[PDB]
Design a protein around this ligand. Structure first.
Ligand SMILES: [Mg+2]
Ligand SMILES: [Zn+2]
Ligand SMILES: [Zn+2]
Lengths: 49, 49, 392, 144, 1341
DNA sequence: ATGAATGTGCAACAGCATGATCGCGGCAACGTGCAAAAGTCGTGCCAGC
RNA sequence: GCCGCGAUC
């Protein structure tokens, strides 16, 4: 829950979510149970406020 | 810019992108020269609905 | 607002991040001090501190002193970084750095036409790399893009030939650093040279306000069909001859050209050839190049003029006039339709400008461009032949 | 002084950027008296330089009364100016952009022929930026 | 005797015409002298570290009976020499050791001590040293420090130009600028009110501080005004008579003197009436009552009847008040002057403005005004006032500040306390009142007597003082809780703050920059640089037109020519040739004393202030044989202006014509014929020429080349050399002549020349010897000439046969047309050494070993690597070839079966390790030179490391063996003489070694004394050789203590030869520059009758408009010199007799017009005449001094001596058509320099490189594959053209369209040329930024 | 003759002062103890050679 | 992501 986090602002490294639970393109717009990071194209770090 | 924004913020005004400076900032065709004809066609479509 | 990286995995907190983190640091402690039933003075002070921190984050340098970071410099807030100079100067509003652009020192090329600039073959093959990829793939020399990349780096001879094929009629526009007026960025037709500096036509130096003592110019490539037409029909050097400020021709010969024209059109009291009568301007060149006559001698030459009183028609009149050998030689480059009283002078940097202005007004644009090129060629040649030198 | 001239050019360009020739002729009868500029006893600007490349708002009358010389709303050029200078004309009333009378732009006639090309100015040219650049191009050489 | 050996090699034909009195000083004296006075021990505390130690130490606790007593200090020996320190990459410094002891005082017995621990030295801090050239080698760099020219502390009066309120009221203000502490100002209102701006707070009355100095209302009025007494006895009301007071006034009533009318009512006011009244001795007389109404009472009379009194000072009087004072018995009433003719009403008005009349009230007022926080409690305000001013430590006027304070106030004493007293504020207030009244004048702010100069020593002293204050504050806490067992190092000696501050100053400061290394001239002119910027200086934007102007006192102290051009003009200066600094820090200039009409040779040094009183003559004024001036009227400079004065009124004489100019402008021949701005440009351009392959002397110079080259430290000067013994391409050894030796151990002087070595500007530094073998060498002789130096002569260019003529437009504007023989003869070819570095450092997963074996790299790239993994020395490299083979370990602990089979089929690592191998950057070619592997201690040394150490040992032993050879030779000679003295065996003794067993014993005395002493000397000399050989073997080969993260480092140098080419910039030394335009073949250059084609063709059109007459005169003079050289060369071609050659050289040396050149070949032997003639066969290198040199007549005579056209122009034939050019063309030899602006470093071209995360725009600048920035003006021009599609494609698809870039790249590769534009990322970033504020911006549909 | 409203003048605070290139260095802000879970290590297991 | 310093037009 810092200034640069993963639950909001989108992911950090490509289509890979935190903890490696869901890191693929088979999953789109899913929320991992352990971590709230959503899968996206990591270009959404420029839009989420 | 601090003065202009607030006097524009409280009034809730619009830009409408009529001059050349506004269109250069956005990156569209300026209403002059070769780009003037393109802005003439667009005006009729907006007025006609 | 990414962190600034440094040696090792340590990531330094930037200016913007510090301003935020102070705000949350105050906010957590305040929202805690609310529920502890703290005395009014302490929560009052914390509220003032949080309010000041928020104000400093939103605009540093207002309502008191300016907070500072590691160095004794203000920490720029959201206000100071809107885009560049608190406005939109650097990163927006005509401040975009563009690719497909080069930069090198400029020298003089007198063999060039009015619409040509010498472009090094090393800047080309880099500005026109995607065009080269397209032409390589079109002709089947490289089936895959990777092969085209590898062979462009290896710079085989066929790559040079394909670059010459691509360049043929793709206008490129050069500009100087302080673009004062609209003539400070003009589009030329590149000619590849085995060299390392841009060769600029001497006539356009007055428009560019550029002199060859270390001056550099940028080379921007218009890479679209609309852009190429705009750079050909609106920005070509042969297109804008009259300056858009007073109507006088900005592209006018100066320096060595003017000196050569002045030396050619002068009269000496006594020289090789006095009172000679010769058939026309053709004989004036033969007599001078043979050494039998001097450029400043006074003779009588039978010369033909062309006149435009008739509606769209040229009438030819022939008469015997008293002039010099140099003026007779110079007359051979002027186009049809100009009276002879326009070269029977000294041509001192003003009569030549009026010569070009009258040629433009009466004849048009193509004749005046050809006339300007011929004038500069002959002025350079005869200034060099004169051997004018400054001594003590 | 180059900085103080560049700032002036910046301000002029910002003010004049929104100016494009969007009309052909507003039809207004307004004009501006253009007499040769004189200072004391020396001729310092002839009428030919001031009125060249402009449109006549009203017909110029020769000293002989009831004698028309040029039609109203016509462009003056080398032939017209040479004919006009042969006579003894002193004042010519010509239309200018201050009285274009059009909205959001300037009529192609009220603004005279462009100085870059011989013909009259075509629609769409950004005359404001050209004017600002022309005014601010000198200034780096003005003696202050 | 008249000429030295190196001068005998080539004598410059000086044109002189004016004898020199004082020779040029060391020319680098400011830096070396400042650092010497910063480091050298001083018995007193004048300056240096000792002064700072006395200022801070001793220290003691707060009544803790413990004090810190110190004695002396010492600086240790540096652990690396300059060369090794430069190569390794660390700061050249020395340890700092200080002697100080601990004393413990008795608590029970006052003023008694119980313990005294005299501890030894404690190490504290690193102080970098200055190299003998004047550079501070820090972090493996040069880092010269420029002196600062800042405002001198003192008292400065100003008038503010008289235009603040636009009312025409000139406002006088005073400032008290200290060396350290708070400021203090006095300011005059439009309403004539005294305002004091303390530390630049709000304007405050001066009366508050005046009362805070314990001054009462009556006392301040008495001190600041002249009071008068009005006596009213028996209703007469008499008035005192002071004739000098009343000058302009109106007689409101008849004035009678002793009952006789003297001045009538409204009578004459002329000085005659005043003189008549003064002549008559008249006592007090009565005056009208209404006259006293306007007067103001100063004192406060007390009524004797009751305690009530009229104590209202600075107030008028009432009619009823007269009755009250008469009843009280006030016979005499004291009132101030109240006169306004020259004086005015002040002070009293300010006392009426503010009512605080108490010291405590004033203190609390000023404390509240300066500090708006907590109010004081009778202690805070007093402490704040004590700390602000009249404090020993917090505020401190410098000694020079005190001197200027006393001089500005005209005080006899020049010394005093460095603190301001109560009388001082009164004095400055009085002087401000006087300057307002009319007396006195305002001083100029740009006066060089008011602008102090400070050097590296003073700045380093200030930084050390700050560090000392910090460590003292840290130490003071120890003694409070310190026990007797606490030793000095255990008492937080705390060297860290001092070292941190010193290194911060030396490494990162406004006035410690990278030194320029192109030519010795750039180094010389950078070391003696005057900078007005810096910490205590002024901002570039802050400087007005007045500062950037040439004040008339910049005559002999600051150069008026040499200065940067665009931004920094007038803010960066250069010291003149003869200028130095005062004992306080003011610039002086030499002058010659003139007594009666004859100028003596005695030299007096005058500061800026002193020279404004005398009358100073001109250097270019004629003299007589005895010394009198040749005219009765002589031009002079009296006080800033110049006029003509009588021969008997002359007081001082200029030493030489070079006095005004600096070093950089002194090397321009015919400087007086050049325009001032063009001379500025030429002087600035000289400091940029790159040293070429071969040094080439200037055919025409100013004789100052030798002084520039010798004192720059670039050359190798024989310190005490005699006759050279062995000359090598890298070493020179000289056997010193016997007349001067150091007794004991004998010895020879050995020089280790520095071969090809990278400079700061990537240029190469080379040293080539001059002497051949057995050549005698005197003191100060130059043996090895560095870059751009020929026989000790600064030579930073090459002479070129320049012809001034336009050549088919190829020399248009400022373009230069160059022949191809220039390229073929390898002129202007320069060496550029570039540094590429690689460091092997450990990481998380293991060590980063370096080896040749690099996975996934073919055998093609391994061709040029050794068994260690770095390229062979001498391998020619280009493109992107691998240089060092370095591997970075990767993390993997899960051996999956795929990885198992990978390790089974491939090597054990299976290419797990990465390859972080340094590659040659793009555009860099050239053969490698050196590799500089260094190893951390403990780790196994590299295979090639042993060869480096073995080479070092080889050179070490070879260098030490020569002195040992000489010493044992002397011992053998002594033993041979002893054995010849008795029992000589002739050659038999010499045949047997060890002196044939020491010749047995022979006589008893010889065996006991001679042979025994010889054996003892041999034994101890052998042992002394062995011990130092062992120590120097040990210290050279040691494990370096690298950085803790760094394990092992490797550095690779490249060497690239840059041949001259069209784009490269070339310039002369007269302000003419240009870029080449074409390398024409030899057969196209114009040729004279004999067929010699010119080398450079210039444009005549550049002379008449730039007023570079130095070009034409230099070309004519060089043509004459080359004609003389050609005559001598042809004469040597026919090998004629020595007598004829000597006669010709003699007749060509004494030519001129009363030149001060008395060289003669009669005292020259045969062999040196031939050597001289073979040395000047290329051309007679003449020298014309700066402002008094060769005239046109002398140049014409020199040309006529060589059988050349007098007018200086020859008939030039065209190279192509062979047709004679109609006019003659001026052909001459001009000295052309090749500047450091090469196109090879100035071309860029980008199509798609690397963008930035924010704004997604391409990067900027070369070495980053950036793109040229499309500025605002360019877009304005695009709009003016009407070109809109170009604007759109240059605004979106080239810069900020993330998808647009890729789409349009694909379209071009396909061949579509379709726009398909979009929305720039920059505007989205701006929208997000604005939305991050409280303002909402959205895009409507 | 005096009070109040108004207009004028003066002082403090805010924004702003050319464009494009090239080359070198130096460079910031914890703790706490237990549940609760999770990971880990010493140990015993069957399956392949 | 700059800050100083120097340089070119
Ligand atoms: Mg230039
Ligand atoms: Zn996850
Ligand atoms: Zn109109």
């Amino acid at each position: 829950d810092g200034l640069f986090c993963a639950r909001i602002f989108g992911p950090v490294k490509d289509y890979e979510c935190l903890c490696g639970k869901y890191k693929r393109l088979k999953h789109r717009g899913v929320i991992c149970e352990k971590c709230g990071v959503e899968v996206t194209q990591t270009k959404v770090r420029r839009e989420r406020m | 810019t601090t003065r202009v924004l607030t006097e524009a913020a409280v009034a809730g005004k619009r830009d409408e992108l009529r001059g050349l400076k506004e269109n250069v900032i956005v990156g569209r065709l300026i209403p002059a020269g070769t780009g003037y004809a393109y802005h003439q066609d667009r005006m009729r479509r907006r007025a006609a609905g | 607002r990414p962190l600034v990286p440094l040696d090792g995995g340590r990531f330094a907190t930037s200016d913007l991040n510090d301003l935020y983190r102070r705000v949350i640091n105050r906010n957590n402690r305040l929202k805690r001090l609310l529920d502890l039933a703290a005395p009014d003075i302490i929560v009052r002070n914390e509220k003032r501190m949080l309010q000041e921190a928020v104000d400093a984050l939103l605009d540093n340098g207002r309502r008191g002193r300016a907070i500072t970071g590691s160095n004794k410099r203000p920490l720029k807030s959201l206000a100071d970084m809107i885009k560049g100079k608190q406005g939109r100067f650097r990163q927006n509003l005509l401040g975009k750095r563009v690719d497909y652009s080069g930069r090198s020192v400029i020298t003089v090329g007198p063999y060039l036409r009015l619409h040509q600039c010498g472009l090094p073959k090393k800047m080309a093959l880099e500005l026109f790399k995607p065009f080269i990829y397209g032409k390589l793939e079109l002709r089947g020399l490289a089936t895959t893009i990777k092969a085209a990349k590898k062979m462009v780096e290896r710079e085989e001879a066929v790559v040079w030939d394909i670059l010459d094929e691509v360049i043929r009629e793709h206008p490129v526009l050069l500009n100087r650093a302080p673009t004062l007026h609209r003539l400070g960025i003009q589009a030329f037709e590149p000619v590849l040279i085995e060299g390392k500096a841009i060769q600029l036509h001497p006539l356009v130096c007055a428009a560019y306000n550029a002199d060859f003592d270390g001056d550099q110019m940028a080379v921007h490539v218009p890479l679209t069909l609309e852009a190429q037409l705009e750079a050909r029909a609106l920005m070509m050097s042969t297109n804008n001859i009259l300056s858009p400020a007073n109507g006088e021709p900005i592209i006018v010969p100066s320096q060595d050209v003017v000196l050569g024209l002045y030396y050619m059109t002068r009269d000496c009291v006594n020289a090789k050839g006095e009172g000679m009568v010769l058939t026309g301007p053709k004989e004036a060149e033969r007599l001078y190049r043979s050494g039998l006559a001097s450029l400043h001698a006074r003779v009588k030459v039978r010369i033909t003029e062309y006149e435009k009183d008739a509606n769209g028609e040229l009438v030819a009149k022939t008469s015997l006039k008293d002039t010099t050998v140099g003026r007779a030689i110079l007359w051979m480059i002027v186009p049809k339709g100009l009276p002879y009283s326009i070269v029977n002078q000294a041509l001192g940097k003003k009569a030549i400008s009026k010569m070009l202005n009258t040629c433009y007004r009466i004849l048009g644009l193509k004749p005046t461009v050809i006339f300007a090129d011929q004038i500069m060629y002959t002025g350079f040649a005869y200034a060099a032949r004169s051997g004018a030198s400054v001594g003590i | 002084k180059t900085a103080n001239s560049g700032y002036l050019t910046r301000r002029l360009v910002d003010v004049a950027q929104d100016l494009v020739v969007t009309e052909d002729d507003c039809g207004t009868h307004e004009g501006i008296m253009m007499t040769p500029v004189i200072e004391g006893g020396d001729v310092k600007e002839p009428l030919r330089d001031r009125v060249l490349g402009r449109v006549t708002a009203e017909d110029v009358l020769k000293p002989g009364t009831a004698d028309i010389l040029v039609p109203r709303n016509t462009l003056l050029h080398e032939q017209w100016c040479d004919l006009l200078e042969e006579n003894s004309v002193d004042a010519v009333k010509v239309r200018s952009v201050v009285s274009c009378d059009t909205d959001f732009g300037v009529c192609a006639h009220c603004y005279g022929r462009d100085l870059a090309r011989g013909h009259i100015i075509n629609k769409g040219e950004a005359i404001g930026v050209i004017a600002a650049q022309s005014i601010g191009e000198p200034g780096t050489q003005l003696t202050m | 005797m008249v000429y030295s050996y190196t001068e005998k090699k080539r004598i410059r034909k000086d044109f002189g015409k004016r004898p020199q009195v004082l020779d040029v000083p060391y020319l680098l004296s400011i830096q070396l002298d400042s650092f010497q006075k910063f480091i050298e021990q001083d018995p007193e505390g004048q300056y240096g570290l000792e002064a700072a130690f006395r200022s801070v130490f001793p220290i003691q606790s707060y009544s803790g009976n413990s004090e810190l007593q110190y004695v002396s200090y010492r600086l240790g020996e540096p652990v690396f020499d300059v060369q090794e320190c430069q190569i390794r990459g660390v700061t050249y410094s020395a340890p700092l050791r200080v002697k100080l002891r601990l004393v413990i005082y008795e608590r029970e017995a006052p003023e008694g001590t119980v313990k005294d621990i005299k501890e030894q030295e404690v190490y504290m801090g690193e102080i970098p040293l200055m190299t003998d050239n004047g550079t501070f080698v820090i972090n493996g760099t040069e880092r010269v420090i420029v002196s600062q020219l800042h405002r001198s502390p003192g008292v400065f009066f100003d008038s503010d130009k008289g235009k603040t309120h636009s009312s025409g009221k000139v406002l006088y203000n005073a400032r008290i600028i200290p060396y350290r502490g708070s400021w203090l100002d006095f300011e005059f209102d439009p309403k004539d009110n005294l305002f004091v701006r303390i530390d630049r707070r709000r304007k405050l009355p001066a009366t508050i501080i005046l009362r805070a100095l314990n001054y009462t209302t009556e006392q301040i009025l008495d001190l600041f005004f002249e009071k008068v007494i009005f006596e009213i006895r028996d209703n007469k009301l008499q008035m005192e008579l002071v004739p000098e007071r009343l000058r302009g006034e109106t007689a409101s009533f008849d004035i009678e003197a002793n009952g006789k009318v003297y001045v009538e009512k409204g009578r004459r006011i002329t000085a005659r009436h005043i003189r008549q009244l003064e002549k008559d001795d008249v006592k007090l007389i009565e005056v009208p009552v209404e006259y006293i109404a306007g007067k103001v009472v100063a004192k406060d009379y007390i009524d004797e009847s009751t305690g009530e009194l009229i104590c209202a000072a600075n107030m008028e009087l009432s009619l009823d008040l007269l009755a009250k004072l008469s009843q009280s018995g006030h016979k005499r009433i004291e009132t101030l002057f109240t006169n306004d003719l020259d004086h005015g009403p002040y002070i009293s008005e300010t006392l009426r403005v503010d009512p605080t009349n108490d010291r405590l009230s004033a203190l609390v007022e000023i404390y509240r005004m300066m500090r708006p926080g907590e109010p004081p409690t009778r202690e805070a305000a007093e402490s704040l006032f004590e700390n602000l001013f009249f404090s020993e430590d917090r505020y401190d006027l410098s000694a020079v500040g005190r001197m200027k304070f006393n001089r500005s106030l005209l005080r006899e004493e020049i010394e005093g306390s460095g603190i301001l007293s109560k009388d001082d504020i009164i004095d400055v207030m009085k002087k401000l009142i006087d300057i307002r009244n009319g007396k006195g004048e305002v001083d100029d702010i740009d006066h060089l007597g008011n602008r102090r100069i400070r050097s590296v020593g003073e700045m380093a002293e200030n930084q050390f003082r700050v560090g000392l204050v910090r460590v003292e504050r840290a130490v003071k806490e120890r003694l409070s809780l310190g026990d007797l067992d606490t030793l000095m190092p255990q008492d937080m000696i705390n060297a860290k703050p001092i070292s941190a501050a010193v290194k911060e100053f030396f490494g990162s400061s406004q006035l410690s920059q990278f030194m320029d290394q192109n030519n010795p001239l750039s180094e010389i002119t950078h070391k003696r640089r005057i900078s007005a910027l810096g910490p205590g200086g002024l901002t570039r934007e802050r400087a007005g037109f007045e500062v950037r102007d040439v004040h008339p006192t910049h005559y002999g102290r600051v150069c008026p020519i040499e200065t940067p051009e665009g931004p920094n003009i007038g803010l960066i200066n250069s010291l003149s040739v003869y200028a130095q600094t005062n004992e306080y820090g003011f610039l002086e200039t030499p002058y010659r004393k003139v007594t009666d009409g004859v100028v003596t040779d005695e030299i007096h040094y005058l500061s800026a202030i002193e020279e404004g009183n005398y009358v100073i003559a001109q250097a270019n004024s004629n003299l007589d044989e005895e010394g009198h001036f040749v005219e009765d009227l002589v031009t002079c400079r009296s006080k800033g202006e110049s006029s003509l004065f009588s021969r008997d009124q002359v007081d001082y004489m200029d030493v030489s014509t070079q006095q005004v100019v600096s070093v950089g402008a002194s090397l321009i021949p015919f400087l007086e014929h050049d325009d001032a701005n063009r001379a500025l440009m030429g002087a600035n351009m000289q400091r940029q020429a790159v040293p070429t392959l071969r040094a080439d002397k200037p055919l025409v110079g100013t004789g100052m080349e030798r002084a520039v080259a010798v004192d720059s430290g670039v050359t190798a000067v024989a310190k005490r050399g005699g006759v050279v013994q062995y000359v090598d391409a890298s070493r020179i050894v000289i056997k010193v002549n016997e007349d001067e030796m150091y007794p004991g151990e004998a010895g020879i002087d050995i020089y280790n020349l520095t071969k090809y070595t990278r400079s700061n500007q990537n240029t190469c530094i080379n040293q080539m010897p001059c002497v051949s073998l057995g050549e005698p060498v005197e003191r100060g002789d130059v043996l090895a000439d560095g870059p751009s130096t020929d026989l000790g002569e600064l030579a930073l260019g090459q002479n070129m046969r320049v012809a001034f003529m336009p050549w088919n437009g190829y020399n248009f504007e400022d373009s230069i047309l160059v022949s191809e023989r220039v390229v073929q003869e390898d002129r202007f070819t320069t060496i550029h050494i570039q540094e590429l570095a690689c460091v092997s450092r450990d990481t998380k997963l293991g060590p980063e070993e370096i080896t040749a074996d690099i996975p996934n790299v073919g055998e093609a790239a391994l061709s040029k690597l050794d068994e260690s993994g770095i390229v062979y020395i001498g391998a020619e490299v280009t493109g992107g070839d691998i240089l060092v083979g370095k591997v970075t370990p990767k993390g993997e602990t899960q051996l999956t079966p795929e990885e198992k089979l990978l390790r089974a089929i491939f090597g054990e690592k299976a290419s797990d390790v990465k390859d972080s191998s340094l590659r040659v950057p793009n555009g860099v070619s050239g053969t490698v030179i050196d590799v500089q592997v260094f190893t951390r201690d403990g780790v196994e040394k590299d295979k090639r490391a042993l060869e480096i150490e073995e080479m070092q040992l080889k050179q070490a032993k070879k260098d030490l063996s020569e002195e040992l050879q000489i010493l044992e030779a002397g011992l053998f000679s002594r033993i041979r003489a002893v054995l010849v003295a008795g029992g000589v065996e002739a050659e038999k003794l010499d045949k047997l070694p060890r002196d044939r067993w020491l010749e047995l014993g022979l006589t008893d005395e010889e065996k006991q004394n001679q042979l025994e002493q010889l054996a003892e000397q041999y034994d101890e000399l052998k042992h002394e050789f062995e011990k130092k050989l062992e120590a120097k073997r040990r210290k050279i080969t040691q494990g370096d203590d690298l950085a803790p993260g760094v394990l092992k480092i490797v550095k690779v140098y490249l060497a690239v030869k840059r041949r001259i080419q069209p784009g490269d910039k070339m310039a002369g030394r007269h302000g003419n520059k240009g870029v080449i335009s074409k390398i024409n073949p030899i057969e196209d250059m114009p040729y004279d009758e004999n067929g010699t084609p010119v080398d450079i063709v210039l444009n005549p059109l550049g002379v008449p408009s730039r007023m570079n007459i130095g070009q034409i005169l230099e070309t004519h003079l060089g043509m004459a010199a080359k004609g003389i050289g050609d005559k001598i060369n042809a004469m040597l071609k026919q090998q004629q007799e020595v007598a004829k050659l000597r006669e010709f050289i003699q007749r060509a040396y004494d030519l001129g017009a009363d030149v001060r050149q008395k060289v003669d070949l009669s005292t020259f032997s045969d062999e040196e005449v031939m050597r001289l003639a073979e040395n000047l066969r290329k051309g007679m290198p003449i020298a014309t001094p700066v402002f008094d040199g060769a005239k046109e007549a002398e140049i014409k005579e020199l040309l006529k001596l060589g059988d050349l056209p007098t007018s200086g122009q020859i008939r030039l034939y065209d190279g192509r058509t062979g047709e004679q050019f109609e006019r003659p063309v001026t052909v001459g030899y001009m000295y052309m320099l090749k500047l450091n602006h090469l196109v090879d470093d100035k071309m860029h071209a980008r199509s798609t490189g690397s963008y930035s995360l924010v704004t997604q725009q391409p990067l900027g600048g070369k070495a980053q594959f950036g793109g040229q920035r499309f500025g605002e003006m360019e877009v304005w021009a695009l709009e003016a053209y009407g070109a809109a599609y170009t604007l759109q494609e240059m605004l979106t698809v080239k810069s900020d369209d993330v998808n647009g870039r890729t789409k349009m790249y694909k379209n071009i590769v396909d061949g579509n040329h379709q726009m398909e534009p979009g929305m720039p990322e920059s505007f989205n970033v701006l929208l997000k930024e604005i939305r991050s504020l409280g303002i909402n911006i959205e895009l409507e549909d």
